[model samples]
Target: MKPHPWFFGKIPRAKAEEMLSKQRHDGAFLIRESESAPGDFSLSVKFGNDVQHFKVLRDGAGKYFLWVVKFNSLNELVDYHRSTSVSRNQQIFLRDIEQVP
Candidate 1:
């Protein structure tokens, strides 16, 4: 079977669950499988009244990664939070996080 679009190479289900759990605890309001090349990912989070966009790229060995996070003002997030209490009050502080491969 093909790997899930959200995952590249061989990511075990348990590891995926761990990553998702960390994300939830880390206040990741939104996570999306990147539409870019393999090993790329994107995410968004609420920071005060603004939404922050994060773009991430991983290396071939999956041991290194790079990311860029930017604060963006999008009204849609506010509207979304109003309906979902889970992501009601939050903010995106770290512009980016990078990990060595």
Candidate 2:
């Protein structure tokens, strides 16, 4: 199967930010390769003027999670968060996909 369009592999944080900001939507988001940690990924979700980058960590069990909520796959995590709010402080749902052009 083809990879998800939202998954922009190896893109820098600045590039991700630029894409999210261009959408100008509060819930627009994209997943990119993490800079600090190799083999890991970052979920950049737009909220107002700023975009929150959360580390999509992988455990020894090979599961993915952004905190306590673990998922079998990255796609599963994104699918869940798309319908559910990611943040308690604000209603940040992964509404829009910042697909690469």
Candidate 3:
């Protein structure tokens, strides 16, 4: 399958924050390669003035994980969160996709 716009592969952590920081809106998000783990990825979302990063997990079954939630693909997972909250205490969703600039 083709990759989505939100997937900014191999970008650094600080660079992810820099891109999302420009969004200035809650739920703005992007996915990047995990700096600490080669095969994993990271999801960066804007929450208020701060950007929160979540390490995306992939189990042996090939399902993607965000917290306890799981999905078949990164696109599906991201799409699911666009309509759902990332946090139970907050209304954070994947509202915007930060494309390459």
Candidate 4:
């Protein structure tokens, strides 16, 4: 994995474009079990400074699933995007009634 860019923690815009450029070639983006939330999954991705947060859902086959939630603000969307990035820092809470394979 590459070192976390400083801009992500400070100025996200400048480094975000660069990070997006590398996403196709970098295998750093992926989903994993969340340590903080049981039954929930998270993703590790590079947005700007470091790995951001994202929520995940698992199907009966143990495959991870993702959903897009509508928001009213750009900051909220950015937060959502960053969290969903392929970096470690995001978390998801799987509902109890949901079937887990």
| lDDT digits (tens) for residues 1-101 of candidate 3 | 76567888999999989888888678988889987899898999889889899888888898998878899998888999998887777889898665546
lDDT of 4 by residue, 1-101 (tens): 75322212322333434444455333234344455675464544444344444565545655444454544532343345444532334443211111113
Query: Which is the winner by lDDT between candidate 1 and candidate 3?
Result: 3
- Candidate 2's TM-score reads 0.87
Off by over 4 Å in 1: 1-28, 36-39, 64-101
- Candidate 3 Cα RMSD (Å): 2.2
lDDT computed for candidate 1: 0.37
**lDDT-based ranking:** 3, 2, 4, 1
Candidate with top lDDT is: 3
Question: Could you report the Cα RMSD, in angstroms, for every candidate shown?
Answer: 13.9, 2.0, 2.2, 15.7
For candidate 2, write residues 1-101 as lDDT tens digits: 87676778989999988878877678888888888788888999899989888889888899998867889999999988987888778888887664545
* Cα displacement (Å) at residue 83, model 2: 1.8
lDDT: the better of candidates 2 and 3: 3
- Using TM-score as the yardstick, the better of models 1 and 3 is 3
Clashes of each: 6, 0, 0, 11
* Candidate 1 residue-wise lDDT at 85: 37
Give lDDT tens digits, candidate 1, residues 1-101: 74222223344333434444444234334345444444445544434434454444344444322232211322232233333432324433332212123
